[PDB]
Amino acid sequence: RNDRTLRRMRKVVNIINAMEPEMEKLSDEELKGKTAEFRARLEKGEVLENLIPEAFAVVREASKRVFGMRHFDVQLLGGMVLNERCIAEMRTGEGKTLTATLPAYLNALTGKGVHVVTVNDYLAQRDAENNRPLFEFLGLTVGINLPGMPAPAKREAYAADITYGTNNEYGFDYLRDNMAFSPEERVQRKLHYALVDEVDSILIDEARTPLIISGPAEDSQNENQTLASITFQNYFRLYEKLAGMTGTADTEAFEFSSIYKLDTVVVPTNRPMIRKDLPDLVYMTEAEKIQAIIEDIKERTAKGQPVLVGTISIEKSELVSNELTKAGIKHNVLNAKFHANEAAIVAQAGYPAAVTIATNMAGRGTDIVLGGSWQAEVAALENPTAEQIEKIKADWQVRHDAVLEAGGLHIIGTERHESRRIDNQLRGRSGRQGDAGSSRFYLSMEDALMRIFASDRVSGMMRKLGMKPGEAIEHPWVTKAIANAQRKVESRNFDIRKQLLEYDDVANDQRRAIYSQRNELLDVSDVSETINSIREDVFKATIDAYIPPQSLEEMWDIPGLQERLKNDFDLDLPIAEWLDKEPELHEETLRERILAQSIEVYQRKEEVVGAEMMRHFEKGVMLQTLDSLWKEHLAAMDYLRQGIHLRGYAQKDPKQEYKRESFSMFAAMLESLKYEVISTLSKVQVRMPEE
């Protein structure tokens, strides 16, 4: 764990580092050939992790030739973390994209494929095309999976060495593959490795979201229903190797373990992080709070320090905006209605004494360049020239160093959110890539978040410090108490979710079972041995209902057995005539003649239709019957789950009773499945030109 894994990994980095001279003296085509060489050793039984030093040095050198970018040491480490069942926490702007090229390469080598999982189709395409040169230079192929892509193009994307696509599309492909009627219709290979780009949304927020295929035609208006379902959690759990990335904003390590058996490793930043996060400040009232904020801004901007003020609503942004104006402090508000205005304001938000106010600041952030962006500047030029640019960079170097000397970007949170990951994202907007920076959050006793101390009195004691319009002290214990209360809400919320997951696990295990069976059936061209085997189960169970085993003859319902056979097995047998003609029948030889009779009737149909046609008919029938009963069972399981309000109550766990019910329903479906297959095959009409 911990530094032990990290210290061990650091030893590998020194080896990778020491290999670079050897790597720089190789030709491009020799570099290409290391992939062939890695695979030949793998073929001779080599352990993949033994190849990490050489494999990562090859990628680092290919990247410099191809991208003009050389993986940093910390990116080597992150690449190592992602080859295990691990989340790498890497800070924003640390290079997650390039880092991911490392484990992707390594885990492509055994020829089983790589699924790099993106949040949207834009990224899937962008990263596939950007990386295709790197990976072709190394003798690998790259695939792109999209919604709407024809099955042959998808098959091709999945046959590549490394594939890019969204989570949704991967999951939907799995479901549709589990509705195929021949193994050639499948688009995916075995699920080998999932490298997931942004695990907060993809693995945590979406864990229980069902992916569903829906079903126009059905059964006996005729509206549409669920044919196939899997949660995201249980899709990613089918993979042999699972890993992913997120930012240091974190707070959910214990969820990743609980939901996925994923460890999380915090990866060190390339440069030392020096952002000063100062103690949280508490004020009696919003008004005192806001005045404090105005005062901080006032002092900092006078120093030349840029500020970013994050609020929780439009109304509060307007309030702090109006008060800054009332104090004569120039600023800009990020207004969600004016996207162009916003990008233009962002661009210069790190300019000396810039003040920017943002409402529920969100996505990774567009970066804030200190001193300003100088590129927005040349971008704005219409015929930019050499001496023009260096003038521009020259004045910028000075603005940059000046903003740094002044303490870099100061972040002010005017309120904390209930989720600390949100606060962490705002504050992470400062101190990127080793830059000086600072952060401070403000609270009042009127703030909504004071309600997470589930007690007025407890909360309202804080006012006994008294605060007083200027003489503010600072108590560190408040920062920590607040962080503890956000942590408790998360814990509470998750405890509730994990009880929901334990229900989800009943469906999961059932789905895993039935899909395993289906796939066994799918992979086999001839299903005879099962048919024969299940025909005997079905005949025995059917017969038992009328001939209680080893009972006297007077308990037998030969009338009911005759019709049963007729109506379900198309089998019309003079059973009463047999008994009354052979005293020497006996039960067990009755069962045999019945079984034998259905079988020779089936053989006659087969002779008319043909063996191969028959084999394939059996297999189709088995798949189609599986599918029909499984859609039925999914709806029944659905109704049983929401019925969780009048069944298990006064000291019998409702969970334990649901599990009994669910197990009973599954076990019954599996018996129905055999019944219906044999009944279909029994009753299939065939024109006999004769007897």
Place this chain on the structure above:
Amino acid sequence: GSRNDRTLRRMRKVVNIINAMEPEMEKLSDEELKGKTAEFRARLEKGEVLENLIPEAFAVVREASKRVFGMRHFDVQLLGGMVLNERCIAEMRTGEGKTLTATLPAYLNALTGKGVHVVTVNDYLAQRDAENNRPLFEFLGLTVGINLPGMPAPAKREAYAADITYGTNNEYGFDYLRDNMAFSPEERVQRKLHYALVDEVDSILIDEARTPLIISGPAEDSSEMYKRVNKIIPHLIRQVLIEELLVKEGIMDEGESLYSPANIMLMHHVTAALRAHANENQTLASITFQNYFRLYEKLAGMTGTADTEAFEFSSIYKLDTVVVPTNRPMIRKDLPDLVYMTEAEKIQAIIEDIKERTAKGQPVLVGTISIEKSELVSNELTKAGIKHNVLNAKFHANEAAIVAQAGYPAAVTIATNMAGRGTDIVLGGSWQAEVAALENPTAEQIEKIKADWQVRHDAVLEAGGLHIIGTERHESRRIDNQLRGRSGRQGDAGSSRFYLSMEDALMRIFASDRVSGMMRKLGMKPGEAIEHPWVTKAIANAQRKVESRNFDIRKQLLEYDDVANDQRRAIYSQRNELLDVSDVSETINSIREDVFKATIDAYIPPQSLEEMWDIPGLQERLKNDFDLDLPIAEWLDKEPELHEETLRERILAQSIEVYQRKEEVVGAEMMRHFEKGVMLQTLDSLWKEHLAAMDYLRQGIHLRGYAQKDPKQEYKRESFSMFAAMLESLKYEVISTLSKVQVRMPEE
């Protein structure tokens, strides 16, 4: 002499004069150009007409912009600027330089020293434009002001005292309103409303026409109201209702009704008391944008070739609209609308189009009405093997990167309710951008990037430029027009095509399911196709009937608003008269007479016999409302000889007498400012009372009832009637307040 054609003919002659002035302006020093302003002002002071100044003043602005901004206005921008000097909307297409154009009218409309208000849609543009233009105009010897929310009143007065002011509609209006709550003239922050130049009139003037600006404060009557009214409630055995309800008390029952448009606040008290089972602010002041902008002596504004709404500007604001030509010929090819049986036939036709165009290297932008519709067309493009990108509103950084390459050869981009104006699509891609990954550029580097871009640029132009596919039209044609106008900007080749199907929602605008359902019979066979120009015109005419219909409905609302406006214009006119004078005594003396005459009329009927006089009603009336206890009867026992009119005189007289005493104790200046104060305050009170009671009458325009005996109109008459009653209660209450005012006399 026709209309717009003739306008542009005459403006073009002026443009040729302005261009001829340019070498003269060139040769002038910077200080000489700065002096032009003072020289134009000396001319105006000696009686010159402003419009005689247009050519000189424009040559001056245009040469100042060269030297300062390094940009020289185009001839089309001179035209746009002359338009904006008139009560007109200059319609100039996206990309044409509205922001620079607007410096010309602003400069000219500043020369008379009365101020300009540039109106922006937000604070960011206000500020940016202010700062960007300060150097231009300070070069021309003028000053520039910025007005923002929260700005302190001194700062605000300075911004309005600048030559040219920038700010949002909202803040202009709110300043106005608060100026009308001032108790002294020096509290006002604005000057008289001279010229407003509105930057984007579609949102500011149309969409936002009826949006009220409201100042509220508890600034109210207290209670006792609620709780007297409470005390009926513990006998409401809920079994007719009105007579029951009426059942005595105060301020009603002399056989006066409860739902008189007059006892409206009272009735609201009971509607609230009894609806109550299942402080408050109040409006201190309100105005609409439409009625704010109508206060200005000159109004003008800009928008892009985004018309369709000309008839509403003229109807609502009396703004004419001039369509300004483009600096370069606008060659976008806007092709016949196509109509398909089914959504599915339509999409298939779209695909084939994108497919043939991208094979010849032309870029396509595909605009849809929803996310669902975007996913559909995208998936079908993927099914056809066609690469593209969707603009996903969740991924704003993705979207910016998509757009930057959206004019790239064979690029295909799908947009969901794409907005107006928006971020441009550069053909070939963006070449001063491309460098914006490039951390240390050189001689060779950009040169390269730029030449390479040229080849891409020229190849896209030769392929037809950007093609726009509208997959469905909107009900608003303005929107469709904003989408097609993404293409063919600044003289570039481009084209547009809109697609429609019988299954499309928009087919509903043809008020007959069967009349719509005819086209079916011109039955659109799959891969084949024809084009009929009458369909295109029919669709456009349908959209225009839908618009004109919604605007008939709006007009009716605006009739309601005309009542309010007329009442507020009149009371605020009375309020400002008062505010602007130190001494309101003549006003006061005049209205006490009026008040005293009429009060006496009510008991002594003019010319009456001394037995048609009621003094058991007259003297009480006096001691009650005026603190003026005159035992008149007991005079009248002594002088039977005196006569009605010289008794009215002696009545009057007294009140003056007792009031001059109150004054020689308080001080004349004190008394004078207390009187203006009483008059302002009383009018403020009654006004706010009126605003509330009308709000309540208006929401009687619901189920008090009636698509039947004309609700509106009855409303206008009850409202004007109550307004004219309020002006008389203002007079009576002022005089009551000043007659009852307590000030401690002498001693003993």
